Design an enzyme around this catalytic site. Structure first.
Site, PDB file in Angstrom:
ATOM      1  N   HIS A   1     -36.558 -93.311  47.979  1.00 15.26           N
ATOM      2  CA  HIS A   1     -36.930 -92.544  49.190  1.00 15.26           C
ATOM      3  C   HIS A   1     -35.846 -92.802  50.379  1.00 15.26           C
ATOM      4  O   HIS A   1     -36.011 -92.372  51.595  1.00 15.26           O
ATOM      5  CB  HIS A   1     -38.562 -92.790  49.580  1.00 15.26           C
ATOM      6  CG  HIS A   1     -38.852 -94.154  50.337  1.00 15.26           C
ATOM      7  ND1 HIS A   1     -39.927 -94.955  49.665  1.00 15.26           N
ATOM      8  CD2 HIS A   1     -38.224 -94.937  51.241  1.00 15.26           C
ATOM      9  CE1 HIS A   1     -39.816 -96.093  50.512  1.00 15.26           C
ATOM     10  NE2 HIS A   1     -38.731 -95.922  51.223  1.00 15.26           N
TER      11      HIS A   1
ATOM     12  N   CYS B   1     -38.857-101.905  53.646  1.00 17.33           N
ATOM     13  CA  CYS B   1     -38.923-101.242  51.827  1.00 17.33           C
ATOM     14  C   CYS B   1     -37.633-101.706  51.303  1.00 17.33           C
ATOM     15  O   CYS B   1     -36.584-101.813  51.970  1.00 17.33           O
ATOM     16  CB  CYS B   1     -38.982 -99.700  51.973  1.00 17.33           C
ATOM     17  SG  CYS B   1     -40.824 -99.277  52.460  1.00 17.33           S
TER      18      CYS B   1
ATOM     19  N   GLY C   1     -38.744-100.153  57.862  1.00 17.11           N
ATOM     20  CA  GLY C   1     -37.444-100.888  57.549  1.00 17.11           C
ATOM     21  C   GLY C   1     -37.585-101.922  56.561  1.00 17.11           C
ATOM     22  O   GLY C   1     -36.486-102.570  55.988  1.00 17.11           O
TER      23      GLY C   1
HETATM   24  C1  LIG Z   1     -36.540 -94.154  58.658  1.00 21.97           C
HETATM   25  C2  LIG Z   1     -37.561 -93.880  57.167  1.00 21.97           C
HETATM   26  O1  LIG Z   1     -37.422 -92.874  56.797  1.00 21.97           O
HETATM   27  N1  LIG Z   1     -37.952 -95.004  56.718  1.00 21.97           N
HETATM   28  C3  LIG Z   1     -37.720 -96.558  57.181  1.00 21.97           C
HETATM   29  C4  LIG Z   1     -37.397 -97.372  55.860  1.00 21.97           C
HETATM   30  N2  LIG Z   1     -38.457 -97.171  55.131  1.00 21.97           N
HETATM   31  C5  LIG Z   1     -39.123 -98.227  54.627  1.00 21.97           C
HETATM   32  C6  LIG Z   1     -40.278 -97.982  53.493  1.00 21.97           C
HETATM   33  O2  LIG Z   1     -39.418 -99.121  55.158  1.00 21.97           O
HETATM   34  C7  LIG Z   1     -38.707 -95.753  54.772  1.00 21.97           C
HETATM   35  C8  LIG Z   1     -39.175 -95.091  55.844  1.00 21.97           C
END
Ligand SMILES: *CC(=O)N1CCN(C(C)=O)CC1
Ligand SMILES: *CC(=O)N1CCN(C(C)=O)CC1
EC number: 3.4.19.12
Lengths: 304, 304
Positions: free
Chosen positions: A41, A145, A143
């Site tokens: 993702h 993940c 942030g």
């Molecule tokens: C910005 C964005 O799409 N994010 C930030 C980073 N993550 C996680 C899962 O921490 C996905 C969503």
């Protein structure tokens, strides 16, 4: 003496954390040898996350769109592939801090440490269990993940978890390092409910042994029970059924304390039926289920 | 979301742990620059510990009696001195893994991480508080002394604790890195009782804020109170008196949640008077007091 919720030392894993940026999405990657592992993702906008087609989204991405930064040094991405729900980014430099490691897919009831990271920077370490419903009860902000879960056996890090998802109920879902989700969860922003959070009965009994070893004994009683009788009580209180396998696993703690597993089951049965009556066990007012028998033996013996 | 008892990443401190052996006593030392810090009782037999004269015991010890081993490499000891209850062993090699560090003497109520070590080898990391009675509730077996407590601000490790003693009640006493005990404890095997374990009121309120931030709100009520009224209830329940300083420290969490400190005090007052009625807050069945306001802000904001 004393029993504490204890994480593995995180140094070996700290040396593997990098920042992965794709377009405007930043999260954490795990750099082992010349591969950086991160949640797929990373290629999504928050809009994409409602119904992403990862294969189609990935076609628009090149090696040079994956910005990988180890502290303040950029890594050159020379290849990328999707394996289930993770990306593998081939970089031109082997991580010099690569520990001996394995990838293991843990079972529900198994515990592990999480190194919470933001922007490839470690923030903290805590101890988790894979819940019977294949969630974990973590501490993860945006942030975080790509933060990973791990056990350490002497010098070998077994990576078991990469962080992917928060469920609207504030619990956490993720993948092993082959990118396969624990449980039925998907990397899509949809209606995903956690099933029953059952208590890990074998882990509670392990922790009752830990308590006895460390002087907390008020809950020992004159009773015994049977697997079948205990399991009637386990059923009623959303406890995992206790198996002979679980009994066999408790054998060493049984042996050390001289308390038969089924006697400790009878203690647990009375605790379930009667509550703690405002008392505490190893400084907890509820029955702790995120120590494994192996965790209790490790901590009670001083393994390194 | 989610709130977890979280230790600092331990890597920076793992790189400082060595084994110190004097005669037949092995414990842990902390190697920073070209000094190894360890408990002075490394020079004692268990017999000595009843009434050691450390100055007299130390006269019989030379540089070459202090065997210092960093993993599998021996360090050459070129000097030794006693500072309060620690030994400082000058070695001929600066620790290449020396992080930026300070020595700080923490106040009761302040939290820190412990890297539990045996034979200079890290076993695990957990989060502690200096209790108001200057004990800590650790997990320490024989061989664990010289294990250290620390905070990390970005890149600087502040060492605040070295492990020295278990009290017969299974709680822990130690020194700052100048070798001064927290509280009235001595490195002698004598009758040393811990005073009252008072609850760190400001830390409980911090943790109630953490709970609200993460969705646990059932304990919010329609009441407010005053510092003086709240403190009558704090007194009755062995809670530290709440000061205006504590209120000022809670200001940012107050601001973020829009719950006035004194309103949250009134919530805590009702929890003290009425118990949790079998309910939980952030997965705890008692009032957690080993998160500082700074800990709650750190974890709730994702500082690295
Ligand atoms: C910005 C964005 O799409 N994010 C930030 C980073 N993550 C996680 C899962 O921490 C996905 C969503
Ligand atoms: C053998 C001995 O005298 N020991 C073992 C090391 N420690 C500690 C405090 O862990 C002191 C007692």
């Amino acid at each position: 003496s004393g029993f504490r919720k204890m994480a593995f030392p995180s140094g070996k894993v700290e040396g593997c954390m990098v920042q992965v940026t794709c377009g405007t999405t930043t999260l954490n990657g795990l750099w082992l040898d010349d591969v950086v592992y991160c949640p797929r993702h990373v290629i999504c906008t928050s809009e994409d996350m409602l119904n992403p087609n990862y294969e189609d989204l990935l076609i628009r991405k090149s090696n040079h769109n994956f910005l990988v930064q180890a502290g303040n040094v950029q890594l050159r991405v020379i290849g990328h592939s999707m394996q289930n729900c993770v990306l593998k980014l081939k970089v031109d430099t082997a991580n010099p801090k690569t520990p001996k490691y394995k990838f293991v897919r843990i079972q529900p009831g198994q515990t592990f440490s999480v190194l919470a990271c933001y922007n490839g920077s470690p923030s903290g370490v805590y101890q988790c269990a894979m819940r019977p419903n294949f969630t974990i009860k973590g501490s993860f902000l945006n942030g975080s993940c790509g933060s990973v879960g791990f056990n350490i056996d002497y010098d070998c890090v077994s990576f078991c978890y990469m962080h992917h998802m928060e469920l609207p109920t504030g619990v956490h879902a993720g993948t092993d390092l082959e990118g396969n989700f624990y449980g039925p969860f998907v990397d899509r922003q949809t209606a995903q409910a956690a099933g029953t959070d059952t208590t890990i009965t074998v882990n509670v009994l392990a922790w009752l042994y830990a308590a006895v070893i460390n002087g907390d004994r008020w809950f020992l009683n004159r009773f015994t029970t049977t697997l079948n009788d205990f399991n009637l009580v386990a059923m009623k209180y959303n406890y995992e059924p206790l198996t002979q396998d679980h009994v066999d696993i408790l054998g060493p703690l049984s042996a050390q304390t001289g308390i038969a597993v089924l006697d400790m089951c009878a203690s647990l049965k009375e605790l379930l039926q009667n509550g703690m009556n405002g008392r505490t066990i190893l400084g907890s007012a509820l029955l702790e289920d995120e120590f494994t028998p192996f965790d209790v033996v490790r901590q009670c013996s001083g393994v390194t």
